[PDB]
Amino acid sequence: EIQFLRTDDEVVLQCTATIHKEQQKLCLAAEGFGNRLCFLESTSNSKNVPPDLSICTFVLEQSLSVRALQEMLANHRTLLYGHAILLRHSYSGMYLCCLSTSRSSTDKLAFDVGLQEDTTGEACWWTIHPASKQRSEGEKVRVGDDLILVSVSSERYLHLSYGNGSLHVDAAFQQTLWSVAPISSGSEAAQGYLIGGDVLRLLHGHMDECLTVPSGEHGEEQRRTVHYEGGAVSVHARSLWRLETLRVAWSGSHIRWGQPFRLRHVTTGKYLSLMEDKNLLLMDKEKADVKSTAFTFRSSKEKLDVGVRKEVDGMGTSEIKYGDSVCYIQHVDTGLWLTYQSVDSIQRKAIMHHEGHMDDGISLSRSQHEESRTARVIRSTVFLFNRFIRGLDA
Amino acid sequence: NYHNIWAKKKKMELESKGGGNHPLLVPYDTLTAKEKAKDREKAQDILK
């Protein structure tokens, strides 16, 4: 049965761009701290560059009719065309709105689109309209349907601008077709079970030490190595990894055994990978390919590969459980098993071996949302302040 | 008085042409501060 979009569902807004005669798929993105203005994240070349959906996911808090919304300003519901939706940015907790200010991208009438803290006012609310005549007012909004979004405050469509040199998103009188992709559903999620997009710590077979990078010796080249360390690093931020699936739609679903995924270090922003010389090395987003950066959780060291497995469009089933399930990381393409180098805090190097060791089981602990937000803020602040220092030095 | 000498000479010039009107021919009181700037400042510097 066709899935409908209800409230409290985590989704991403997708738009298509025919730049130089190729179809490029873009997602609406916004970084909470720092610049409040929204931008666009490319999700077409996911094979070449991983997409950052953590700043593209939005959640549908409230869906209200126009008159009910007007009365509310004056004084798990299913979405229908013609309602006004409140989109909250999942990472920041702030809401999509029209800033009422223009960056002057050659369109005088256009207004900027960004994030706002408070729900009060008509700027945060957006009304959804049918894409074509196959949908009518009041009809349920399907997951695979295209949506036309109009700001209540300005009556300006959420518009994709081509004329400007770099593709932007803004509120303009020209209309743009936006497609909603279901990332995850809050209610159907199972507590204590691994889902896509989680920030987690890879606790090793001793349950006392986790996979970490070297500390902040001010060397971004020494930060690239990956090793096993224990102690307070289990509660520091440099032990945080985000599990991003290779799928855009239903990327927040339950992770099955054998599912390919990418591991990213939150503080450094770099993806775990397997170089051709059998060593694990953090490496940049721009060159982070699926060939090297794809890993799977597998129940046992036994060599029977999962083979080919159905891509399911939904929550899926809860298989991996936090804190008790024993997982073995295996590279997708090489088939190597992740294991400790075992050479003599402990600082045991992590290597990529054919058979591994007996205690290569790695448990999973889900980091707190506050801790993950703090780590992301740390990364963003480090980037901005390093840019500032380099500019001042120049 | 200085705007008056200017106005008389401009009036003589315009009836010497035989036709036309100049926007500044209006009296000093009708003039604006921007227009009054030149004669006011030159009177200021002579007195100063």
Partner: protein, 374 residues
């Protein structure tokens, strides 16, 4: 029907013309300047292989944009709804403000016309109305400004008066000569003024209170308005509008400011013609509102006291009015209107007033001049 029209026009922005489509448009002011340049250029204005056959394209563009601005300003919501806070009306006004910048509206009003001139032969050389820029075009700029943006702040009021309004008043007052008065352009400019500009200045009268800094501008306004009021081609309604605007602004103005206008009133009133009726009312209102200024040695603390020059002026005004009225034939309206004026001047002037021992000699020559006082 206004909200629907605004919504349709914003859904199809190409209805606003190339200058306001929003993608590369140069703005309303640049559109007007380009249209004036086109209208001056013979090639683009006409087909170039009488007037119906020769559609002046610059004038067509200017009329199009003026009509668009007029329609939008009329689609602007009512002030009572805005004050009640009707959210949809507030939203419509915000949309119109976003559509039309205020600076462009100020610049279009700042644009001046080309006055008709007397030729060497002596006949009037009148430029074609349909060829160039007409005051009715700015009459829409004024409606949009007073219905959407609204004149609510005193510095902007004065800035507009300085840049765009007062030059038109000066042009109209300079077109007051016998030959130039009958020109169609003078009639059009007087219509534009008395229909759009003067009523706006009557409606925004209270803001004129605190203008101590812009004394020159506020005096030029009064002088130009009075000069225009002393006109022939003005109709009854136009003259009434001028009267209302003048006696509304002078009521709010500070007493010391209108002293210069008093010096021309004292020379025009004793004639006791039909034109003096409005000066009679203006003098009555002024000397009734500011009676304590003259009689009390201290007066109001903020405005102060008289300079003894306006005291001599009021004395001579009173005496001239009294003698001319004594020697004038009985007219009912004139003698019912001049009695309050005489009684108010007599009350305002202190009974123990000391006539100036140092009488002013060698006054401004233009004051004694009667041929237009210029």
């Amino acid at each position: 029907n206004a909200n629907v029209v605004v919504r349709l026009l914003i859904r199809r922005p190409e209805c606003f013309g190339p200058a306001l489509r929003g993608e590369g448009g140069n703005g309303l002011l640049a559109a007007m300047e380009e249209a004036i340049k086109i209208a001056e250029d013979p090639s683009r204005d006409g087909p170039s292989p009488e007037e119906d056959d020769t559609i002046h394209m610059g004038n067509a563009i200017m009329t199009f944009y003026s009509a668009l601005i007029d329609l939008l300003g009329r689609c602007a919501p009512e002030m009572h709804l805005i004050h009640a806070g009707k959210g949809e009306a507030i939203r419509i006004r915000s949309i119109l403000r976003s559509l039309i910048p205020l600076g462009d509206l100020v610049g279009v009003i700042s644009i001046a016309f080309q006055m008709p001139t007397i030729a060497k032969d002596g006949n009037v050389v009148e430029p074609d109305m349909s060829a160039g820029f007409c005051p009715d075009h700015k009459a829409a700029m004024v409606l949009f400004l007073d219905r959407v943006y609204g004149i609510e702040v005193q510095d902007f009021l004065l800035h507009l008066l300085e840049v765009g309004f007062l030059p038109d008043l000066r042009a109209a007052a300079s077109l007051d000569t016998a030959a130039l008065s009958a020109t169609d352009m003078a009639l059009a400019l007087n219509r534009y003024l008395c229909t759009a500009v003067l009523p706006l200045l009557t409606r925004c009268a209270p803001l004129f209170a605190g203008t101590e800094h812009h004394a020159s501008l506020i005096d030029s306004l009064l002088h130009t308005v009075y000069r225009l009021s002393k006109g022939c081609s003005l109709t009854k309604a136009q003259r009434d509008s001028i009267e209302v605007c003048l006696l509304s602004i002078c009521g709010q103005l500070r007493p010391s400011m209108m002293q210069h206008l008093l010096r021309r009133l004292v020379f025009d009133v004793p004639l006791l013609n039909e034109h003096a009726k409005m000066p009679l009312k203006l003098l009555t209102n002024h000397y009734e509102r500011c009676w304590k200024y003259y009689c009390l040695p201290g007066g109001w603390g903020n405005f102060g006291a008289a300079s003894e020059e306006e005291l001599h002026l009021s004395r001579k005004l009173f005496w001239g009015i009294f003698d001319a009225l004594s020697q004038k034939k009985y007219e009912q309206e004139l003698f019912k209107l001049a009695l309050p004026c005489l009684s108010a001047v007599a009350g305002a002037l202190p009974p123990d007033y000391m006539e100036s021992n140092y009488v002013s000699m060698m006054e401004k020559q233009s004051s004694m001049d009667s041929e237009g006082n210029f």
